[PDB]
From a paper:
The high-affinity Cu transporter [name] (Km ≈ 2 μM), an integral membrane protein localized to the plasma membrane and endosomal vesicles, mediates cellular Cu uptake in eukaryotes from fungi, insects, plants, fish and vertebrates, thus playing a broad but unique role in biology. To provide a molecular understanding of Cu+ conduction by [name], we determine the X-ray crystal structures of an engineered [name] [name] protein, revealing an ion channel-like architecture, and unambiguously identify two Cu+ binding sites along the permeation pathway using X-ray anomalous diffraction. The overall sCtr1cryst symmetric trimer architecture is consistent with genetic evidence for homo-oligomerization and the low-resolution electron crystallographic model of human Ctr118,19, with each subunit containing an extracellular N-terminal region followed by three transmembrane helices (TM1-3) and an intracellular C-terminus.
We determined the crystal structure of sCtr1cryst in the Cu+-free state at 3.0 Å resolution. Experimental phases to 3.4 Å resolution were calculated from a single-wavelength anomalous diffraction experiment with a Ta6Br12-derived crystal. Experimental electron density, shown alongside the final refined 2Fo−Fc electron density, is of sufficient quality for model building. Essential for Cu+ uptake activity, two strictly conserved methionine residues in an MX3M sequence motif in TM2 (M146 and M150 in sCtr1) form two layers of methionine triads, constituting a potential Cu+ selectivity filter at the extracellular entrance. The ion conduction pore widens below the selectivity filter owing to tilting of the pore-lining helices TM2, resulting in an enlarged central cavity. Interestingly, the last four amino acids in the C-terminus, including the HCH motif, are the only segment of sCtr1cryst not resolved in the electron density map, implying a structurally flexible C-terminal tail. However, only crystals grown in crystallization conditions containing zinc acetate diffracted X-rays well and allowed structure determination.
Author numbering:
A (entry chain A), B (entry chain A), C (entry chain A): 41 to 93, 1002 to 1018, 1023 to 1047, 1055 to 1105, 121 to 182
C-alpha cells in the first residue's frame, strides 16, 4: 500500500520491468540510485555550462568599449577591454585547430590594446583612437565568427534541459511506487550525487 | 497499467474530464503541451523580473554613496552614482505619467552630479560636498516614492510563484496518468517551451 | 477518485496515518501546510547560505592580489585587498572565541594594508612590496585556518539539500492523494511560506 518493504510483484515504470526477487531488487535500487545521481550532476553540469556562457559579457564588453572610445578617458575603456580579452581567450567548447586560430587572434588583440594604451600614457589622444579602429579588423578576422561557441552552448543546454525534465519525472514515478527500498535509493542517490558534482565544480575554479 | 498507449477511459485530473476518443486525446495532448510550455515561460519570466529587481542595487548605490561623500575621493563616489542613476532611469514596471515624472527627476539627478564633479575636477572639495547635500532633495521629490516599482514587483513575483507551483503539481498529475501520449506531450512541451522563452530573454539585453 | 472532497478513509504516506474524521483532517491539513512552508524556507535558506559562501571571492581576492603585487600599480591591488578584507571580517558561521580571534586578525590586516598604501601614495615602491610580503604572515596566523567556516558551510548545505529532496517527494505524495483539502493546504503553504522567507531575506541586507 503505502511505504512498504518488498521485493515481490514490484513494477518499475515499464510493463517489461517487474521485480520478484531480492537480486532483481538490488539491480533496481542500483539503477534508481544512479538515476538520482545522474540527475544531480545533470542540473549542476547544466548550470556550470550556463555560467561559462561570462563569454557573452566579455564579448559585449569589447564591442561596447569600442563604441565608447570611438577626451583622454579612452585608456580606462581599453584597460577594461584588455581584461575582457584575456578571460575570453581562456574559453573552450565543452567536451583544436579552430581553437589555436581563435586563441592566437586574441594575442594580437591584447598586443594592439597595449600599443593604444602606450599612446594614452604618453598623452596622445587622436592616435590612440585611430589604433582602436584597427582593432575591429582583428576581431572580425579571428574571433567574431567563432559566436559558434555560444550557439553550440545554447543548443547543448536545451538538449540537457529536456533530458533533465524526463529524468525528474522518471524519479517521481519510481518514488511514487511507494517501495521504501527504491525511495531510499533515490534519496541516497540525490544526497551523494549532489555532493560529488558539487565537489567537482569546487575542483574547477570558483568565483562569483 | 504502466506506460500504456491509449485514448480510452483516460481520466485527466478532474472528474468531469475523461477522454474516450482520439479527437479528445489530441485536445488533451494540446493542453498538456501548452501547460508544459506555460510552466517553462513562467519559471523563466519569474526569474527575469527578479533579476530586474539591479534597481535595488542602483537605489542602494546612490544612497550608500551620499553617506560616503557626506578628502578628494568624492569624485569616484559621484561617478559611481552617475552610472547607477542612468541604469535606474531605464527601469520600467512590468506590462506613463508617473514614469515621465520619474525619468525626468533622474535627468536632474545626473545633471546635478556632473556639476558636483566639475568642482572636484577643478579641485574644489567643500563646495562639491555642499552640492551633494542638495542631491537628496531631488530624489525625495521625484524618485524615492516611485519603491512602489519595487513593491509591485515583489507581489507580482509572489503571485507568479504560487501559480508556478500549482502548474508543476498539475503536470506531475498528468504524467502520473502513465499515458505515453500525455507524458510525451508534457516532455515535448517542456523542451520547446524552454527553448522559446530562453530565446526571448536572449532577444532582451544579456549581461551578468 | 480524482480531486475529491473528503475526510474519510484518506491515507497519508504511512500505513499508521489514516484520517477518518474532520478533526483529523485539519491536523493533516495543518501538517501539509507546515511542510509546504518548511520546504520554501528550506530552498530559500539553502540559497542564502550558498551566496554567503562571497567569502570564497574575498579569500581569493586577497591571495590573488598578493601574487599580483609580488611598477606603481600596487596601490590599486591593495585597495582591492582592503575592500575584500572588510567584507570578509563581517562574516560569521550560521546559527565566539574563535570569531573574536578571527575578526581581530583582520583589523591587523587592514591596518598593515593602509601602511603599504601610505608608502605608495608618497611614491615609494620597493618598500610597499616588502610590507605586502609581511601581510601573508598575518593571514596564516589568524585568518587562513578559520576555511573551517567554508567547509562547515558546504557540509551544512549538503545536509539541507538531502532534506529538501525528501520533503519535495513527500509533498508530491500528499498532492498525489488527490484530496482537494490536502492539495490546497500544500498550495497555500507554498504561497505563504515563500512570501515569508522571501520577506526575511529582504530583512537581511540586499545586494547583487
Ligand atoms: Zn538538487
Ligand atoms: Zn525547466
Ligand atoms: Zn518555490
Amino acid at each position: 500500500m503505502t511505504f512498504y518493504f518488498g521485493y515481490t510483484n514490484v513494477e518499475l515504470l515499464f510493463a517489461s520491468l517487474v521485480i520478484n526477487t531480492p537480486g532483481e531488487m538490488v539491480a533496481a535500487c542500483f539503477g534508481c540510485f544512479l538515476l538520482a545521481v545522474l540527475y544531480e550532476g545533470l542540473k549542476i553540469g547544466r548550470e556550470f555550462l550556463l555560467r561559462r556562457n561570462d563569454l557573452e559579457d566579455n564579448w559585449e564588453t569589447l564591442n561596447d568599449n569600442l563604441k565608447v572610445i570611438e577626451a583622454a578617458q579612452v585608456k580606462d575603456a581599453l584597460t577594461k577591454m584588455r581584461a575582457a580579452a584575456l578571460d575570453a581567450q581562456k574559453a573552450t567548447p565543452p567536451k583544436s585547430p579552430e581553437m589555436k586560430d581563435f586563441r592566437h587572434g586574441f594575442d594580437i588583440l591584447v598586443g594592439q590594446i597595449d600599443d593604444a594604451l602606450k599612446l594614452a600614457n604618453e598623452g596622445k589622444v587622436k592616435e590612440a583612437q585611430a589604433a582602436a579602429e584597427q582593432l575591429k579588423t582583428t576581431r572580425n578576422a579571428y574571433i567574431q565568427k567563432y559566436q559558434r561557441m555560444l550557439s553550440m552552448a545554447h543548443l547543448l543546454q536545451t538538449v540537457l534541459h529536456v533530458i533533465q525534465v524526463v529524468v525528474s519525472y522518471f524519479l517521481m514515478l519510481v518514488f511514487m511506487t511507494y517501495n521504501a527500498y527504491l525511495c531510499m535509493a533515490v534519496a541516497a542517490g540525490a544526497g551523494l550525487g549532489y555532493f560529488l558534482f558539487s565537489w567537482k565544480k569546487a575542483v574547477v575554479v570558483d568565483i562569483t
